[PDB]
Design a protein around this ligand. Structure first.
Ligand SMILES: *[C@@H]1O[C@H](CO)[C@@H](O[C@@H]2O[C@H](CO)[C@@H](O[C@@H]3O[C@H](CO)[C@@H](O)[C@H](O[C@H]4O[C@H](CO)[C@@H](O)[C@H](O)[C@@H]4O)[C@@H]3O)[C@H](O)[C@H]2NC(C)=O)[C@H](O)[C@H]1NC(C)=O
Ligand SMILES: *[C@@H]1O[C@H](CO)[C@@H](O[C@@H]2O[C@H](CO)[C@@H](O)[C@H](O)[C@H]2NC(C)=O)[C@H](O)[C@H]1NC(C)=O
Ligand SMILES: *[C@@H]1O[C@H](CO)[C@@H](O[C@@H]2O[C@H](CO)[C@@H](O)[C@H](O)[C@H]2NC(C)=O)[C@H](O)[C@H]1NC(C)=O
Ligand SMILES: CCCCC/C=C\C/C=C/CCCCCCCC(=O)O
Ligand SMILES: CC(=O)N[C@@H]1[C@@H](O)[C@H](O)[C@@H](CO)O[C@H]1O
Ligand SMILES: CC(=O)N[C@@H]1[C@@H](O)[C@H](O)[C@@H](CO)O[C@H]1O
Ligand SMILES: CC(=O)N[C@@H]1[C@@H](O)[C@H](O)[C@@H](CO)O[C@H]1O
Ligand SMILES: CC(=O)N[C@@H]1[C@@H](O)[C@H](O)[C@@H](CO)O[C@H]1O
Ligand SMILES: CC(=O)N[C@@H]1[C@@H](O)[C@H](O)[C@@H](CO)O[C@H]1O
Ligand SMILES: CC(=O)N[C@@H]1[C@@H](O)[C@H](O)[C@@H](CO)O[C@H]1O
Ligand SMILES: *[C@@H]1O[C@H](CO)[C@@H](O)[C@H](O)[C@H]1NC(C)=O
Ligand SMILES: *[C@@H]1O[C@H](CO)[C@@H](O)[C@H](O)[C@H]1NC(C)=O
Ligand SMILES: *[C@@H]1O[C@H](CO)[C@@H](O)[C@H](O)[C@H]1NC(C)=O
Ligand SMILES: *[C@@H]1O[C@H](CO)[C@@H](O)[C@H](O)[C@H]1NC(C)=O
Ligand SMILES: *[C@@H]1O[C@H](CO)[C@@H](O)[C@H](O)[C@H]1NC(C)=O
Ligand SMILES: *[C@@H]1O[C@H](CO)[C@@H](O)[C@H](O)[C@H]1NC(C)=O
Ligand SMILES: *[C@@H]1O[C@H](CO)[C@@H](O)[C@H](O)[C@H]1NC(C)=O
Ligand SMILES: *[C@@H]1O[C@H](CO)[C@@H](O)[C@H](O)[C@H]1NC(C)=O
Ligand SMILES: *[C@@H]1O[C@H](CO)[C@@H](O)[C@H](O)[C@H]1NC(C)=O
Ligand SMILES: *[C@@H]1O[C@H](CO)[C@@H](O)[C@H](O)[C@H]1NC(C)=O
Ligand SMILES: *[C@@H]1O[C@H](CO)[C@@H](O)[C@H](O)[C@H]1NC(C)=O
Lengths: 220, 441, 433, 196, 49
């Protein structure tokens, strides 16, 4: 509380370029997993949910799935046999069938919970045989490309599996009877300077090595 | 800015008027005195750290000796500067001495704060970092004073000692100096006090410049009004400026940030697993903990030694400044000096000291001429075969007649047998003119 | 460090101690930790397919293992002492268990090389935890156990792979077993009486995180009733220290447990056995200075405290935990205790007269040893003597005589010159150094 | 006390440099021969290095303090040199620079690591009050003293120096005339001697 | 001699500062490359400190 410290780690650089992916009402590439990825999504009808982690995305190598079913958060690390497109089908406003994998065996993990108007953020990191997930939430305007501002993410869960994670994927939803977008960044090793309020809240942060003024503030 | 003066070789410039100016010069005198306890800094609520610091306590004795010497010198400096009078002269009830208004540099009988008004203006322009020397233990745990700089400074064994002389004693010293200067001249700076009227004292001060006694006696009202206007002007300039007292604020800021850096340098690891002595002792055995505690002990001893060295250097600089201030007070308040630009810019007449926090402020009263005018001059004047030379001053001409006058003021006088002396015959000096000389019959 | 002091005022260094009561606060956990479920499960996996389990809501009392029939050939702990495992609290604890060859027990360590350390099971260089192993030749010698032998790289410090693809030593996948195409999984040869480096061993590896998160598993320590407003030596989840504890108004998120200030000192904490935030402060405070009129003159002293109010002194000068010689200085029956602008002076009498300064105390107060029998007397400094002179506008003073005076002024000029030999000080009669 | 102080700190620092030779500095002993009598080459070359660095730091602190004290002594020596130049080989008009009163002479004496100046000065005494005037006019013209003051006898008027009492008659010299005696406050009416 | 003396002192101090980088200070070597190239993280941290 009420202090200015500086730390070194893997952070998203300020004023960096993301990638625009859209769900068309008329995509899920194998995004690389480096030192960590940042996921930010804008939705209105809860269309985007779920991720797939792995290296080969076949039945010769274990893979991890983490998704929402509309009533449960099913996460399990098994040897999956993923087909062409992981999907989610809803009929007349209610869910009736999920199409996310075909076969799964030799499976060593399982967990379950009970569960443009909004903006959702998710940051993933994988160090020392763990998977770190960070979450933040704020409502945004009716129509915008990327919501500009400043937000701080909070951890939710820490998953203990030792897996070779080099690629990530996305799980979509199509109506069987709207459109959305998500943005993906890439973490980099940088040095940051932060300040705390009289409470335990982070209010501002400066990315050094961006421009000479922030480098001067990093030195000072 | 360029001026582009020219050499005339035959004409001279003589002032026609004069003005009175009051200037300001600020010198630091003393700095804050601190004391450092090795325990509660290198250790604290830890018996093993003290038992390991028992072999390093000699360095602690060295550091404490250095800090005690610094504090003794700091207490000596202000007594060297301010304690110059032999007696405490009472403030006169009348603040007017021949039209000179002394009421803005002396305390008033209404007793607001027992110090001068300009001295009051010198305070509240720089800010002390710690408002008051009393900080009880209840004030450090009241629930409101959480995360305080001075309170966290105190918990690590770094305290600040108060000066020997309070502000009221310094104000009384300066008031005694001013009240002894006005009613007794500068004669009380060497021997007993000799009373003298203020107008005759000012005539004496003007005689030490090169101007005769009369010039005050026909222009006393103008000189008094110029002095009062200068005092009011420097009061207004001191009130409406917040960047002229930077040295004392600089001293306070350097001391505060040095103590803050010493406090915040306690978070380094110095090659150990942690900077906290409790967590290492709760997860390691004795043999490894001794080494990892000795590393921290050496690092914290080094960080204390660096601060003590910086304090010694700053004390040396402050001692030099205090020596300069004491010499200036002895040579310009208790007397009149002839060294140029030592006290003011023009010709020095008086000086008055005002008390400032960790320093002193001098108000130098100077004499400056103006209203220049060109005059044709000659080196010598001869009327017989013999040649006459001026005893003092120069020869100037009206264009029809010739006179003699002082260099610093235009006072034409007839060339008589007095104020001149004769040596030689007028056939060797270049520029000798022929003119008559008045002779008293 | 002397037996005779001189006249003056000095600073002291708090040689007293506070032997107060102890408090201990540990979480409300009573379920015994499953030591039997881990060490007596009679089904351990292969090293290439090691599995991990979590430990929560436990009490780590391993002395019950003395009640069983388990003897460990190897028990090595890293980053913590084995003698301090009964006093600490751990936040996240994971146990990894498998079966190793027996000559590869040495490879389960940080910064190792071999088949197991490269292809099967790795550990990070900065590893905190313990490694336990024991021989199970009478149980695991009639079962199939495998290990990975061929791989195209080295695994992560915490990672496993269960792939069973065919290995080609230079290229991709051969997809046909034969020449230059081998199965990467080799089988341990576990036969009866094969040696001692070929008999199966069961290995368990524990990982802890210490003093950085809320803790769920702790040692067998009995708690104590919490006290307040007195400085005590405490123990909160394995965090020791001494000080007063007071109520605090900071509420933070439930993933935080401790609180550090600028100097990395523990200032704010949560509590176990309840949920309440508390502030900790040290109970050593204030400046103490002593005044003595020499040693051969007298043995009495006067003590002043810089930052106490001299009407409510003994709250900071508690005389119960110290000697009677300090009880006579904490409170005085007669008027030998008074408050000055520098603090609270005890043991000296105040005087209304003013003299020259003898021993400077501060803020215009001095002291001296006087006959008024003998005692320490404090007084206000006198700047000088008054003169009450008057101003006359028509009268001048003129001296009528003169005198000749001789004055002395002494100035230092030089100091002693010293040469220092680098060796014969750092060394001497020693060619090794 | 200054010269004794100069001797005392130079003795004290040198004595303190020998007390700091009995520190372990994180080693097993402060005696170097006991380290090599119990350990091999490794684990004794480690423990010798910390002792070496600690003793080097102990030497460096002494050298730094000697440098600072030498700077102070240099400043004092400069003051002594300019005082010897200005007060022994001449007369000073600077107030309170050499002595207390009006400076007349100075004599130097040697001292161990120092100099002692004996300042011979002049001081006035036996004060007396006199009624004074700024100017004396007898005709319309006003007269002013060239030096000194215009004090009175009670019946007569004289002129005398400020630092000593020596009354003299008011004649044409020691006096200058400027203006009329109608604007100067404090004008008194008295005669002035004229050498005829 | 005074101006040349202060110039020589300012040069000599900077030349002495750059010559002190060859000391080991009780470590394996005065170069950081071979320390990291020969040791693991735990001991190299001690030597680097
Ligand atoms: C996690 O999974 C990823 C994805 O599979 C994996 O990255 C892969 O690593 C392999 C092995 O290094 C790479 O295969 C290499 O590819 C080229 C030829 O295409 C060559 O550089 C290599 O050939 C070498 O083969 C032998 C290896 O010792 C040598 O004898 C020979 O001389 C060659 O050097 C090699 O076949 C593959 O390209 C990547 N794939 C990707 C997509 O990057 C990664 O290693 C896995 N992580 C862990 C920690 O296991
Ligand atoms: C000296 O200067 C002051 C300031 O200009 C003159 O004015 C006085 O100011 C003080 C401030 O506290 C007031 O109390 C007085 O009432 C003011 N006096 C008048 C007449 O207004 C002051 O008059 C000057 N003194 C003399 C003797 O002339
Ligand atoms: C140590 O182990 C023995 C068994 O080896 C335990 O004794 C059993 O305790 C249970 C629980 O009370 C009883 O029901 C059984 O009858 C006991 N005997 C056997 C043979 O199982 C004993 O409790 C353990 N603990 C201690 C502290 O001695
Ligand atoms: C004949 C030697 C030629 C020179 C080799 C020198 C350096 C390269 C590596 C040397 C280490 C020796 C082999 C270690 C194998 C470990 C296998 C195990 O742990 O089971
Ligand atoms: C009014 C008057 O006399 N002005 C003169 C001017 O003529 C002359 O050029 C100047 C420099 O000498 O000094 C002035
Ligand atoms: C007295 C004197 O120096 N007069 C000089 C004169 O000799 C010279 O000829 C003239 C022009 O330069 O300037 C003037
Ligand atoms: C009877 C008993 O054990 N009560 C405890 C109580 O003392 C403790 O404060 C609370 C929170 O842990 O848990 C319960
Ligand atoms: C209740 C009490 O003790 N109040 C004291 C008061 O008497 C004293 O004047 C003041 C300053 O010292 O500190 C407080
Ligand atoms: C004999 C004489 O001159 N006495 C005076 C006296 O009248 C005056 O009151 C006093 C203070 O000024 O100084 C003296
Ligand atoms: C020369 C002079 O200043 N004389 C004054 C006089 O004018 C005044 O009347 C008297 C009382 O105040 O004090 C005196
Ligand atoms: C693994 O995937 C391949 C490719 O689709 C398929 O032929 C094979 O049957 C799968 N094996 C199992 C066990 O599902
Ligand atoms: C993997 O799954 C297969 C198919 O169900 C099964 O036969 C085999 O035993 C499993 N192996 C392991 C190691 O779990
Ligand atoms: C800090 O917390 C308090 C108490 O909950 C809250 O009222 C306040 O808004 C927060 N922020 C600041 C800046 O004080
Ligand atoms: C000198 O200056 C003053 C102030 O401006 C003025 O009143 C006076 O007349 C001037 N005197 C002469 C002789 O010019
Ligand atoms: C001086 O010159 C002026 C003209 O400037 C003239 O009137 C006057 O008579 C001259 N002499 C004196 C003595 O003033
Ligand atoms: C004096 O000198 C002036 C200037 O040259 C000249 O006119 C005049 O005749 C001289 N007088 C005598 C007596 O030579
Ligand atoms: C496991 O439990 C059984 C049944 O109580 C017992 O006989 C055996 O000794 C236990 N094994 C160990 C290693 O304690
Ligand atoms: C000293 O003076 C104070 C203030 O009047 C008074 O209270 C006190 O009794 C005096 N002490 C003595 C010993 O006269
Ligand atoms: C001056 O003082 C001396 C020394 O006491 C004395 O002999 C002499 O008479 C005094 N002179 C006068 C004029 O009072
Ligand atoms: C001073 O006045 C007195 C009294 O009239 C007189 O006797 C004496 O001569 C005068 N002069 C001196 C120099 O004392
Ligand atoms: C001498 O001066 C006094 C005082 O002003 C005055 O009363 C008197 O008339 C003057 N005498 C003459 C002769 O003017």
């Amino acid at each position: 509380s009420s202090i200015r410290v500086l730390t070194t780690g893997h952070f998203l650089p300020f004023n960096t370029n993301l990638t625009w992916y859209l769900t068309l009402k008329s995509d899920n590439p194998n995004i690389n997993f480096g030192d960590g990825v940042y996921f930010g999504l804008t939705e209105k009808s809860n269309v985007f949910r779920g991720w797939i982690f792995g290296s080969t995305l076949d039945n010769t190598t274990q893979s991890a799935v983490l998704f929402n079913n509309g009533t449960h958060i099913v996460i399990d690390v098994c040897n999956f046999n993923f087909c062409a497109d992981p999907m989610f089908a809803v009929n007349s406003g209610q869910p009736y069938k999920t199409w996310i994998y075909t076969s799964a065996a030799n499976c060593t993990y399982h967990r379950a919970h009970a569960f443009f108007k909004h903006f959702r953020e998710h940051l993933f990191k994988n160090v020392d045989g763990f998977l770190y997930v960070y979450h933040n939430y704020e409502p945004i305007d009716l129509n915008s490309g990327f919501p500009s501002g400043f937000s701080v993410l909070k951890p939710i869960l820490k998953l203990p599996f030792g897996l070779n994670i080099t690629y990530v994927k996305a799980i979509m939803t199509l109506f069987s009877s709207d459109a959305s977008a998500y943005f993906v960044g890439h973490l980099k090793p940088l040095t940051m300077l932060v300040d705390f309020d009289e409470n335990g809240t982070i209010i501002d942060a400066i990315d050094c090595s961006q421009d000479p003024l922030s480098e001067l503030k990093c030195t000072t | 800015d360029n001026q582009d003066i020219v050499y005339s070789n035959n004409t001279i410039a003589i002032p026609m008027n004069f003005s009175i100016s009051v200037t300001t010069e600020v010198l630091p005198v003393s700095m804050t005195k601190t004391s450092v306890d090795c325990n509660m800094y290198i250790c604290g609520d830890s018996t093993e750290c003290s038992n390991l610091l028992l072999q390093y306590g000699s360095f602690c004795t060295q550091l404490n000796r250095a800090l005690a010497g610094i504090a003794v010198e700091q207490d000596r400096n202000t007594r060297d500067v301010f304690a110059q009078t032999k007696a405490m002269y009472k403030t006169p009830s009348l603040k007017d001495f021949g039209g000179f208004n002394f009421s803005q540099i002396l305390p008033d009988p209404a007793k607001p704060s027992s110090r001068s008004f300009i001295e009051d203006l010198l305070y509240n322009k720089v800010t002390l970092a710690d408002p008051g020397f009393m900080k009880q233990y209840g004030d450090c745990l009241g629930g409101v004073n959480a995360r305080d700089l001075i309170c966290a400074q105190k918990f690590n064994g770094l305290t600040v000692l108060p000066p020997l002389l309070t502000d009221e004693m310094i104000a009384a010293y300066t008031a005694a100096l001013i009240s002894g200067t006005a009613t007794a001249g500068f004669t009380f700076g060497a021997g007993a006090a000799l009373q003298i009227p203020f107008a005759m004292q000012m005539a004496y001060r003007f005689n030490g410049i090169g101007v005769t006694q009369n010039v005050l006696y026909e222009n006393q009202k103008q000189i008094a009004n110029q002095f009062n206007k200068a005092i009011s002007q420097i009061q207004d300039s001191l009130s409406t400026t917040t960047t002229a007292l930077g040295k004392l604020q600089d001293v306070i800021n350097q001391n505060a940030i040095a103590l803050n850096t010493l406090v915040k340098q306690l978070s380094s690891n110095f090659g150990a697993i942690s900077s906290v002595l409790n967590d290492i002792l709760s997860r390691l055995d004795k043999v490894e903990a001794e080494v990892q505690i000795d590393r921290l002990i050496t690092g914290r001893l080094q960080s204390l030694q660096t601060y003590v060295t910086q304090q010694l250097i700053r004390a040396a600089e402050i001692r030099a400044s205090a020596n300069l201030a004491a010499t200036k007070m002895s040579e310009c308040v208790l007397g009149q000096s002839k060294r140029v630009d030592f006290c003011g810019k023009g010709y020095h007449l008086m000086s008055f000291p005002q008390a400032a926090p960790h320093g002193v402020v001098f108000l130098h009263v100077t004499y400056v001429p103006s209203q220049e005018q060109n005059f044709t001059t000659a080196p010598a004047i001869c009327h017989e075969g013999k040649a006459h030379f001026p005893r003092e001053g120069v020869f100037v001409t009206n264009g029809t007649h010739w006179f003699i006058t002082q260099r610093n003021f235009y006072s034409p006088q007839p060339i008589t047998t007095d104020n001149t002396f004769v040596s030689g015959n007028c056939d060797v000096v270049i520029g000798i003119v022929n003119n008559t000389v008045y002779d008293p019959l | 460090k002397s037996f005779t002091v001189e006249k003056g005022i000095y600073q002291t260094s708090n040689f007293r101690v506070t032997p107060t009561t102890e408090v201990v606060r540990f979480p409300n956990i009573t379920q015994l930790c499953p030591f039997n479920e881990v060490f007596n499960i009679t089904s351990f996996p292969s090293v290439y397919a090691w599995e991990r389990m979590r430990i929560t809501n436990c009490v780590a009392d391993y002395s019950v293992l003395y009640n069983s029939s388990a003897s460990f050939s190897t028990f090595q702990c890293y980053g913590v002492s084995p003698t301090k495992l009964n006093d600490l609290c751990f936040s996240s604890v994971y146990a990894d268990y498998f079966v190793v060859k027996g000559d590869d027990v040495r490879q389960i360590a940080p910064a190792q090389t071999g088949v197991i350390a490269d292809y099967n099971y790795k550990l990070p260089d900065d590893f905190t935890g313990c490694v336990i192993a024991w021989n199970t030749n009478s149980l695991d010698s009639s079962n199939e156990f495998f290990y990975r032998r061929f791989r195209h790289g080295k695994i992560k410090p915490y990672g496993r792979d269960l792939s069973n693809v065919l290995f080609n030593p230079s290229g991709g996948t051969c997809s046909a077993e034969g020449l230059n195409c081998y199965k990467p999984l080799a089988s341990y040869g576990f036969t009866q009486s094969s040696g001692i480096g070929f008999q199966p061993y069961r290995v368990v590896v524990l990982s802890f995180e210490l003093l950085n998160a809320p803790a769920t598993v702790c040692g067998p320590k009995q708690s104590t009733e919490l006290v307040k407003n007195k400085c005590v030596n405490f123990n909160f989840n394995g965090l020791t220290g001494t000080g007063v504890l007071t109520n605090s108004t900071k509420k933070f998120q439930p993933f935080q447990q401790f609180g550090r200030d600028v100097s990395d000192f523990t200032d704010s904490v949560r509590d176990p056995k309840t949920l309440e935030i508390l502030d900790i402060a040290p109970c050593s405070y204030g400046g103490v200075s002593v005044i003595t009129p020499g040693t051969n003159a007298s043995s009495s002293v006067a003590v002043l405290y810089q930052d106490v109010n001299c009407t409510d002194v003994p709250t900071m000068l508690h005389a119960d935990q110290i000697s009677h010689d300090w009880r006579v200085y904490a409170f005085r029956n007669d008027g030998n205790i008074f408050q000055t602008q520098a603090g609270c002076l005890i043991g000296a009498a105040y005087d209304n007269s003013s003299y020259e300064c003898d021993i400077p105390i501060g803020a215009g107060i001095c002291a001296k040893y006087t006959n008024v029998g003998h005692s320490i007397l404090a007084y206000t400094m006198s700047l000088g003597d008054n003169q009450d002179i008057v101003y006359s506008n028509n009268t001048i003073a003129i001296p009528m005589n003169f005198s000749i005076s001789v004055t002395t002024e002494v100035l230092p000029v030089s100091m002693t010159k010293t040469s220092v030999d680098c060796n014969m000080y750092i060394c001497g009669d020693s060619t090794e150094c």
